[PDB]
Symmetry: D2
Subunit: 264 residues, 4 copies
């Protein structure tokens, strides 16, 4: 099938990529980075996230595979030593597809109420553009709390082991179609009150952040951080789109968590 390979760009990843291209040349595999059906990422989770964003308009046509060339790689299923076995397995079509949920972020602006939308595989975060962060949190049009603090993080299931975890969030199995909102350093006193706890939302719930004073925010989507000025609303919901992985053997999520956080 049509495939492409992205590389972190260090010597080890570049050479592994060239050797995999050579191995694929022995099968009916066409290198095509415009319309790949398989996208292989060689590097770390940063490389994988960049691969996802490179192809986020063709997610229903692509299955992703990650090779980790460091000690990490939550989205990675393969070690570099196994690349030749992976070339063979992929060239024979011997794989199942597994899908994880994604997060949709919509940013609405002032004069004209125009919108930008973003898809996240790990999370989308919001902070102030300098100065105090204060937003009203509105859940399905219900005013839920006024948040004062450093920022907020909305995670996908597979993102729950990333920034979300560092913020005290729950780790959620990716078969659950949900998003999880965590706080960054909320202020809580007799006058200012937030829920504190992480919140887990199902599909079709909408969480809107509404400015109270300042309308400028730094919004991240996975690695990408962007200053948005004149914001009227930031809206979070579980995307209808999913990312698909090519799976060749069992590697359960909870074993992946064990291997990344308990010991390997």
């Amino acid at each position: 099938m049509k495939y492409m390979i992205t590389s972190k760009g260090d010597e080890k990843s570049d050479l592994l990529r060239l050797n995999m291209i050579a191995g694929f040349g022995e099968y009916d595999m066409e290198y095509d980075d415009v319309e790949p059906e398989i996208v292989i990422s060689i590097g770390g989770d940063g490389t994988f996230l960049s691969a996802f964003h490179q192809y986020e308009e063709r997610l229903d046509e692509i299955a992703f595979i990650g090779i980790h060339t460091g000690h990490l790689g939550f989205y990675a299923d393969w070690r570099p030593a196994e690349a030749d076995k992976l070339v063979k397995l992929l060239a024979k079509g011997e794989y199942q597809k597994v899908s994880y949920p994604l997060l949709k972020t919509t940013v609405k602006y002032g004069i004209g109420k125009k919108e930008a939308t973003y898809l996240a595989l790990n999370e989308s975060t919001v902070k102030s553009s300098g100065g105090p962060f204060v937003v009203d949190v509105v859940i399905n049009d219900i005013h839920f709390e006024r948040f004062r603090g450093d920022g907020l993080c909305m995670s996908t299931p597979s993102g729950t082991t990333a920034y979300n975890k560092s913020l005290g969030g729950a780790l959620m199995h990716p078969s659950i179609e949900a998003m999880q909102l965590t706080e960054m350093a909320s202020i809580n006193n007799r006058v200012y009150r937030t829920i504190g706890s992480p919140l887990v939302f199902p599909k079709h719930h909408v969480v809107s952040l509404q400015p109270v004073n300042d309308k400028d925010f730094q919004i991240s989507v996975d690695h990408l951080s962007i200053l948005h000025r004149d914001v009227q609303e930031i809206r979070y919901e579980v995307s209808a789109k999913k990312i698909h992985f090519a799976r060749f053997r069992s590697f359960p999520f909870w074993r992946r968590v064990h291997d990344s956080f308990i010991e390997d």
Copy 2:
């Protein structure tokens, strides 16, 4: 329809119960506490939990309603001042049913591998029977961690605002069929390691706790705490059974959370 009313048993709840029985006597409503179709709890969440356990063998035939006579009542939809409106609405059949997920706990023993099963509406917790608590946590037959600490808590979605919240768990919307495992004071050092984070499991995942040394445990299921001796395994999974509520007006979960924790 057939109904019954449980009361906390203080003067206020007992009198409200008698006045509601009087009002129901003006409709085609039969008091029947053997096979009720509607169970009304007057008191607090403790009273509601006791009502649930009284009828846990007929959950598919019953819709529950809670009236709170104090300042609390997460499972309560009604204030005592509204009891006459509730009598009327219920007597006319003007309600929809909403279902929340439940937690199944199985305790397996020694000589004979016999089993006890329990259903929980809030949570099931495990602690040692005195002396150190150490269990292996096995997820779908994958050895995930060896837990050392005070205990573990497995929560339903609606239980996530209860003990789970105090332990740092996420609050989960009850449309999500899941259970959430939280730690109580885990020990973490260079030799002993746990995940720390709360874990959220979908339906059909099984979490087994397996003793390492001591086989005696104090196991709670909602308010009920029982010493179990000679335990071989404690198994948690999302139940196939659900609790059904009679709903007469919108009172969204997130508004309920707001009212209980942010302000009312």
Copy 3:
């Protein structure tokens, strides 16, 4: 004695200031904002912090008093309704002085190893200037951990109820000469490890943060945030300097905490 009054600058604080100046004119009190012996802050804790920094070179010659014109004011001992009683008490010399500890921050640079020093009443925080934050934490020349995450916060005792509290720090009575280091969203996995827990340091311990890759940092000292480029070291220690408060009646720290966080 020589005094001055700073105001938040809204109508309520400005008018209270003018009325207090009028009342002081009935005693042997000279308004002097170059060498005051008493500095009165009318506003919130932000106003008080600004007053502290305005006079941080004459801290051994000044006693501070705060009036809070909102609902807040941890450093405030007086409500606006009591300003006339305060004018009288102050004009008669009827007060004791209480001292709180301060935090010294030293920032060392590249070409020339030049230094900037800062005093903090609440805390000093460090974050990256964009991009990843990674520092080595060195305690009394002992390499203690490599911190990866959003940032670090070093608090004074009286600052422990501020940013430190939101980050999970302990609240420390200000008779303890100490500083407290808290983490902001540390990453912890099989490869990256931090202590997690807040750390409390006595006087004479030195905590040095040493860059690992990027040498540019955003450093805050109380409200003031400054981009520092080409940083070689950030050094924290309990200052030899103290802030002095004029106290006219008992208002214990723990009662102040109760009133600010439990109820008033």
Copy 4:
């Protein structure tokens, strides 16, 4: 000098003890377990804590040394391989003494207001004797909060790396004469409020726990857990007594923390 050696009682610790007794027999060292001046503990921190409690009436006459025969031993300064070097160093008097603070717990009862006092090296904890735990927390006679939850923990500085750490407490250098109060699973909602944060108290502050309903409590002091009935008050303060360690080389507290929690 007069010395004694306690052993964990496994083969490795018992044999090391016998070999150390043999080595001491080559110096002017008298084995005396009634009035030792040096107490050597061979085992783990549990063994060390038991040694401390065995001699808690002669703490001003004793210096303690711990050898750890497992992977642990926060109070241990020596590995078994170094026991012969320790015999020699101790027999020559080549050591300095370092002191850590201790916690005094006083339990007052009903009919007669009689008192029991306890000293703790790690911590003293309070839980209910079954059923709900509710106490008023009174600090220097100031009603500070009504605590509802699983229990409370009051730690010494050196105990801050023990149960206190698992409960989210700060780690405090033992040169600070203080105690630290942490919560176990407090309930917090619109009706029930606690501070949440750990609290650090200086010497001479008194923290009293006062029953609200049930008067029976399970009180731990280091490893020892005791049911106390008819309790009127539990009082915590930093002890005037200190534990003394014999130190033969530098092993800073923060390096000890690094070695126990970061890596060794």
